[PDB]
Amino acid sequence: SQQTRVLQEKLRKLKEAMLCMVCCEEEINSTFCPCGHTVCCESCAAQLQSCPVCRSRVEHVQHVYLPTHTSL
């Protein structure tokens, strides 16, 4: 039905919100500290000296273990 299409779009958008904002390919699993923006995978987060959301300096990256995490 048309509701199947609406729900597929909602699911796609929620899943996209959990993917890295830089590479768009891997799940978010890293927080920039101390600002707290949690928007990147570990690979993109390691390459940024400044937060890509607020531009605060990244003192270090904290790995986050989230219940929504998925794998092959």
Binding site for a second copy (CB under 8 A): 1, 3-4, 7-8, 10-11, 14-15, 17-18, 21, 28, 31, 33-39, 53, 62-68
- What whole-number distance in Å separates Cα of residue 9 and Cα of residue 35? 31
Separation between Cα atoms, residue 7 and residue 21, nearest integer Å: 23
Q: With binding defined as CB under 5 A, does residue 28 bind Zn ion? A: no
Structure tokens of 44?
A: 């993109």
> In this structure, what are the phi and psi dihedrals at residue 65, rounded to the nearest 5 degrees?
-105, 105
Give which of a second copy, Zn ion, none residue 48 binds (C-beta under 5 to 8 Å, depending on kind): none
Interaction of residue 35 with Zn ion, rule CB under 5 A: yes
Residue placing its CB nearer to a second copy in the complex, 23 or 64: 64
CB 50 within 8 A of CB 33: no
* The binder of Zn ion chosen from 19, 37, 38, 48 (CB under 5 A): 37
